[PDB]
Amino acid sequence: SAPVVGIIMGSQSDWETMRHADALLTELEIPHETLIVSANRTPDRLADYARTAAERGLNVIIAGAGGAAHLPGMCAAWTRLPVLGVPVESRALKGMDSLLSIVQMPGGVPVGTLAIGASGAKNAALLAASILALYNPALAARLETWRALQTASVPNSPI
Amino acid sequence: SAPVVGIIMGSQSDWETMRHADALLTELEIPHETLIVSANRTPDRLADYARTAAERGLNVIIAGAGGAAHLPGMCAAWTRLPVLGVPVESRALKGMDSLLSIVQMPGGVPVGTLAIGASGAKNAALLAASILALYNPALAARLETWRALQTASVPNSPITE
Amino acid sequence: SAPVVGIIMGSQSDWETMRHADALLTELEIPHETLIVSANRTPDRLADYARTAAERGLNVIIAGAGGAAHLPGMCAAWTRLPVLGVPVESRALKGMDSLLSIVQMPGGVPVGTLAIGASGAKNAALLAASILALYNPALAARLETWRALQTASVPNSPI
Amino acid sequence: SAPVVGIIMGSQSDWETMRHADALLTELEIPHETLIVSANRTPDRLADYARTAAERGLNVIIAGAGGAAHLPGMCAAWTRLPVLGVPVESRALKGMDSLLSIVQMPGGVPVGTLAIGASGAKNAALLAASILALYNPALAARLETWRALQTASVPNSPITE
Amino acid sequence: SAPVVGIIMGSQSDWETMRHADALLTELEIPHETLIVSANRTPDRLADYARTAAERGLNVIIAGAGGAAHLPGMCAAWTRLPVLGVPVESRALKGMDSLLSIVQMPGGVPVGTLAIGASGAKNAALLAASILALYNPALAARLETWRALQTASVPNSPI
Amino acid sequence: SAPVVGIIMGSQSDWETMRHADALLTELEIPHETLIVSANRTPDRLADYARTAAERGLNVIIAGAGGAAHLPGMCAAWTRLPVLGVPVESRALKGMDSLLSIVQMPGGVPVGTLAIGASGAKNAALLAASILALYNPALAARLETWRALQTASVPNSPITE
Amino acid sequence: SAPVVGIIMGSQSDWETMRHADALLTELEIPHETLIVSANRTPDRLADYARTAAERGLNVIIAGAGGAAHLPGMCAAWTRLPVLGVPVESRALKGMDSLLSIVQMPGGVPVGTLAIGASGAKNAALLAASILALYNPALAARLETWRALQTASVPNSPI
Amino acid sequence: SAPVVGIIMGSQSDWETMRHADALLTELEIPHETLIVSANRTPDRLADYARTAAERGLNVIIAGAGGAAHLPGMCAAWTRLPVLGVPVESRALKGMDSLLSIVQMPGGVPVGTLAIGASGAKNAALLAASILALYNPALAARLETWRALQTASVPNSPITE
Q: Are D32 and D4 in contact, with CB atoms under 8 Å apart?
């Protein structure tokens, strides 16, 4: 029941993208929390969140943000837990700024980065699931089923 | 002694970059294997490697490749294990082709991507360590100490010569 | 009657783009098959398809995909046949990721790459036609006519 | 002895890159000619070359050029034969201008484009070989052997020094 | 009455952009011709056009095209006249491919390149006008008036 | 003697670039401090530095960092003082990642960004000087003289060898 | 009452973006002027404006422009005052041309550059406010309140 | 002897590139002047230069600058004469900033832009020559001969070593 994955995003505007991560975790029945935490507007909120994540029982953190996206990297700076980053598509630069701001972390503080947008949010949840599956047999089986259904469901010819 | 992390790369030319992942895992005392698997030249070798990774005891796979870097993504297509990708810097496009070819995986098949080059290789190892630390108290303690030392080792001022 | 060109695409979403390749081949009366094969979701389907392509009588394979587009390159990895790649326009990066993921193949495993989008799908079919024309006199004549009509049909002044 | 593949390039500076296409065709025993044809300096030479390629016995044309690389596209405008383009790396833009100038052909006039640089040149030759192999059993056998050897020659592990 | 400026474009699709060049020349009463000439679809038409331009009395050629835009460069290859190029905005790459394909001409065969899109078409006409003005006093005065009105008409505060 | 400008950078490797900001402030006689503060390795050090900057007497902060350059933006998140950012050139992406990571701050938390590299560092110092000059007549006079000399020192023609 | 901040933009088309800077300054009760000044169409207007800015009592200048954006840099060339630049999003290149044309100023003539678009306009006003706050206690308090409200108003969870 | 073309550049560092424009004009016997005019450091010098260019007898202006290259555009803002711009290659961004800062002029104020670097400088001179040739028969003959020689001088095949 207690969350094992924390999904945080820079603002309400990121929800359209991050809701895909939320839906996936719920689909795989992975207990999680979904919050808004701004690296630039609520720095102390982020510090406290990242710093106490492990103590609170979180295993993986999924962070999404756009533009000069500092949320994933700064979160990783305060926690020992694996942090996965989702570059949210920005208006002007289409998420290229989001992507470079997240993926280019210097050696020492990693952020597992996923694709720009919805695909990335969905994959961050799946990646978090694959991480949890390493020590949760029941979940591992549900993930196997999920991947199996995905593969088996691809049509053979276009409509 | 059995490896829990597998480091694979597209060619010997990728070693200059991937050796940093190898070195870090060894530093943290994480058993691992290091191999060359080409997505374009040895597709069947990749299929077999990725398909059997879980049953062989591997927990995480770190794949590095450059240019049209398909190695990480295709590995993830065959394994349920988390796959971390390292974009190896390319000559002309400076790893931008490597980066986009790895990070832009479509929804459904993830690849946790790190930075272009040596930093990405080192971080792939560190990310893998943080994953394993979730269920290995001893490793978790070593990682905590490693991160703590890194933070404490940062100088307060530059050597202004 | 048996297909000599195989058109494969990563998903139904690519059809809007790849249908142009299908239409061109049909226009030139080139027997072909149109299928959905995902490099990331159906890897074994792709392996089997590419591996057996030549045995099945295929001469050229046209593969289209977007984003981290691995379909053309992986197809080429399993077949000796010429593989032509169509970068499908992606939402965020407008097919630049698709393009680099396809065209930058390392020496040893080629993929003849065409333009991003519909133009590319249409040109992959035309390129496949020009390849088949080298050993099919009837088709060669139909291709000559097609190219001739294209050239002669260009207006001299804008409307 | 008659050439079946024609390799053309915009200038002597392109040879460093295009020589890889020449070497590969020779390796596979594919008769070919190698010439310099400038789309911007010798437009009429290009027109004549492309227009008469088919009647001269050529089956495939490999064109390499950099910067505002118009050579491949204009060659394709005049010939019905398949034209493969090699983006030669440029100084400032690292071949990105070369690549876009070649690959972005509008619908109706194709240019099968390969990677920027030496890899693209080698692959243009290999692609040309795979095309010719469709109607040349002997060549098809040589190509099959070549691809098979490439796959079998990939090392299993990196020389970790 | 005889045209002194030739406006050529790769296709009808470029008209939306090139019509701005046409309108400007008409505004400044500069005799010109507006035609469709495709470098890739009508290469011989282009060769003939560029080759005979000077003989026909043309002084400047304005060429617009998008994507792998070869029209301006190839036109310049066949004529000694100044050739100005307009990169037409492409669907996927927004004219970046158009721009690089036009502006990066190697030393020896120049193409005076203008901005991507409508602004570029309008400026190619103005640049052509400034060229003709060097030897046409009447036109030079009309151009001075045009530039003067532009400057004087800029509002001092936004509405 | 009390510093009114604080120059911070992510690592010793940034000094080669940031030393230009240091040199210029000293030239204009602007008291300042120069420190290394890592946004990713010493997040708490950054929080404390930025939070207390105003009370410590600082008026402007110049922050330089490369790659995933979060230092300027995070500093601005904690201080009400104007923060100027210098994108340090990165190896692979030539500072483009540095630039976008700094300049693209969302509405509400500004970072006045300068050019990539040494020019940006020098301009960050000059911008800081122009800010301080608004309420420091003596400095305003020195800056005016500096700008005037720069303009008067530009040669009229190139040394055509 | 006399303006202490001058907001200038290249054209009426930039207003949609620069109005955000105007609104912010008004919100913080910072006296300012909002004008249209084109570096390319009204160069002498710009020269006069920038040259006399300090004499007129201005403390900071916020300049916004798109495309080949020369307004901020040229303004800085004529004034000793701090000049902040706002890259306006362009149609084709989405403000990347605007951004590079503004931020890449050579050492010697600075321009404090903000993000592309509305965010940048809003931040230029806030940056100008933070500059004025250094010597205006009342304003400094209003800025503290503004930043405090921003931080406190961020929701904890998405809707 | 009076100059009909004016070549201006932002700094001595631009000469390495702009000297190619100077050399070509001299080759074609086109009288010209070469000066350094900084758009950012000597704005008034630029205003005066551009404003008086026509009355001084100049017919074409070739302006070269890099980075935030405002020189060509601002020159065009003050003169009715055609202005040709040469994007000087920049260190970090390889002239991309130079190119966009010059070519993207808004409708109403044109700058005929050439390629990044030496090729652009040479072509700016050639473009200027083609403009002047429209009303100078002697020059038109020299240009025709120059273009003809260029075309005739292209080798037919590469020196395959």
A: yes
